Design a protein around this ligand. Structure first.
Ligand SMILES: [Zn+2]
Ligand SMILES: [Zn+2]
Lengths: 383, 383
């Protein structure tokens, strides 16, 4: 006849981790708080350090006969809040107003992470039968680099998963596929000369312009001819540019950066080879070269929409949730590089339009419901 | 039996005005020094102020019957010296080493200006006969804006000239034509959006790229089909560029600047109309516009190579000097907008490769010779 966890404690756990400011860093403080919570309920977590102050957390709960392993994953970092004067309620105070809990990370994705942790604790304390293991993977640095996702995958912590749920904000939809993301830089080298006597020089901006023209044309042809049923066309934009030093000097340096959102139908390897081909063609017959660097490279993700994991989730509802795709990347771009296939979906509490915006909040009834829904999902999938 | 001016005084006058630092400013101190020199020799100059601290100087000497008017012009500003540690001899100390007088402005163009002033003084003191007037026009701000050249032309001080010599460094060549110069800016307005969801935005860098492509193609076609016998083809270079604010945001702003060197065969009006046409075509069917601004606009210059002024100069030499053109602008781009035609040439002491460079100098024997040659030119032209 053990006591239940009170509603006020469930809400307080989420408030406490929102108050921990973990902007591109300080995830070790979030991990320590959650590990201490798990220890109060006789679950022993494993801290896996990324760098000083930045720790991943793994935890496991097993019951019954050796069965499947279901992973539950979320990240502990949040994006910057920006000008705090612009917020109605302070971004790291975790204030409650009505059904809304306000704070940076309330929706992306500390509500999902807290709901997963509490679901595991309540699953254990309910005594309800299943046959398998549920594994928490709480990661460092998802927003800039997917640092912990990559670390844990390379280390081997994904190797035993049969299925994985990522708790990003989807509200009541199931995201089973999302685009890749590439950021790239092209640098152009030229030779200075006075603008009145230019034959002594080589115009670095002109050479860079030729790259933009050809890359836009080739990427537009790719968008016109190839597409994904859910995710759409490949996206390409040059987003930053600089060059030159004085209006009457031929520019000896120029640079741009761009962003691409990719689809499985024309994968990242092929996109990078295409950009490299354009650079090679434009460098023919000159010693003043363009150079390509890839700064970010996350692959697209596509799971089986009819997997046993998705069936277990739909069994919790009178009417099926919509299956959807999304443009943004997740830690699944690193976890799916594990050397085996597993069922996958993104499903978590939160307001889909509010990640990374001012006055971010989560609905408290959505958060509390998802604590219950995750337990039902686990019991179905690991039956 | 008045005393001659000593060689040491001729050199000292040039040293004193080089020691006056007149970088884009302070021309009033140069003008005052030269006006005080003229007064010591009973020539009364007229100060024509541009702005506080920045004065033009006009002076006249007449003899004989009413005749032609010959203008002698030079500017009193100099370009910056840059890092003074890089100079072998300090740029505003006017040190003499051998036949070389070192300093910023020694070649461009304080030697020519001092030589013109001393030539007028020695012409007067020699008593030698002529029939006409020689007029000094010493200007403010030639290097950035041709400010005094424009001021004096608009005011009316060019209206009586039959001929004009500009004392820029040509060494022993006669420059009778030079290119125009246009600096322009194109600004591109777009709309920000996340790089993952770009249909909500408009890419300002892409629109700017389309301008570079078309402007380079049209300006290259102009260079391929039209040329000047002396000055060559029209020159065009984009020299500065910027745009965007973050690698994962669609850029809402971008800008470039460029430089054109023009020829009489395709004049500045037509070049600006061409750039405007390109902007208009690219703004069709969109509310996100490119905008053109002209920041500098100096017309090309072409004098009669067989003018009586050029004949008077060639009469001073056993063998004729070469006639030449040049790419750089001069105050003639403003003086030739006067409402009448006059003979024109650029002819002055100095080392043609050294304007605007470190360790600028003039050869003292070249400077002293040009004092004598200007007097001979005046006596021939105003005979
Ligand atoms: Zn997230
Ligand atoms: Zn000059």
């Amino acid at each position: 006849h053990m006591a239940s966890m009170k509603k006020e404690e469930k809400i307080a756990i989420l408030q406490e981790i929102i108050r921990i400011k973990s902007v591109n860093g300080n995830e070790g403080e979030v991990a320590a708080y959650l590990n201490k919570l798990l220890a109060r309920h006789d679950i022993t977590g494993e801290i896996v350090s990324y760098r000083d102050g930045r720790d991943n957390l793994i935890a496991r709960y097993q019951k019954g006969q050796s069965g499947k392993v279901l992973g539950l994953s979320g990240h502990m970092d949040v994006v910057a809040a920006g000008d705090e004067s612009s917020w109605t309620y302070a971004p790291f105070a975790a204030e409650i107003h009505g059904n809304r809990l306000y704070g940076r990370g309330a929706t992306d994705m500390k509500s999902g992470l807290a709901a997963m942790v509490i679901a595991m604790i309540e699953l254990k304390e309910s005594g309800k039968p299943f046959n398998g293991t549920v594994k928490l993977l709480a990661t460092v640095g998802e927003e800039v680099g997917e640092l912990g996702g990559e670390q844990l995958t390379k280390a081997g912590y994904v190797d035993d998963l049969d299925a994985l749920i990522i708790g990003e904000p989807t509200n009541y939809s199931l995201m089973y596929t999302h685009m890749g993301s590439i950021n790239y830089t092209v640098t152009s080298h030229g030779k200075e000369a006075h603008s009145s006597m230019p034959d002594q020089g080589y115009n670095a901006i002109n050479h860079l312009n030729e790259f933009i023209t050809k890359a836009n044309a080739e990427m537009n042809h790719l968008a016109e001819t190839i597409e994904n049923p859910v995710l759409g066309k490949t996206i390409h934009n040059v987003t930053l540019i600089s060059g030159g030093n004085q209006v009457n000097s031929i520019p000896s340096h120029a640079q741009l950066q761009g962003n691409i959102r990719s689809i499985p139908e024309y994968p990242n390897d092929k996109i990078i080879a295409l950009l490299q081909s354009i650079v090679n063609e434009l460098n023919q017959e000159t010693d003043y070269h363009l150079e390509l660097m890839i700064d970010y490279n996350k692959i697209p993700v596509k799971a089986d929409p009819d997997s046993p994991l998705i069936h277990s989730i739909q069994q919790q509802f009178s009417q099926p949730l919509p299956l959807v795709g999304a443009a943004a990347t997740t830690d699944a771009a690193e976890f799916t590089k594990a050397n085996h296939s597993f069922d996958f979906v993104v499903f978590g509490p939160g307001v889909v339009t509010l990640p990374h915006q001012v006055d971010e909040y989560v609905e408290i009834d959505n958060y509390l419901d998802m604590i219950e829904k995750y337990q039902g999902i686990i019991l179905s999938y690991l039956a």
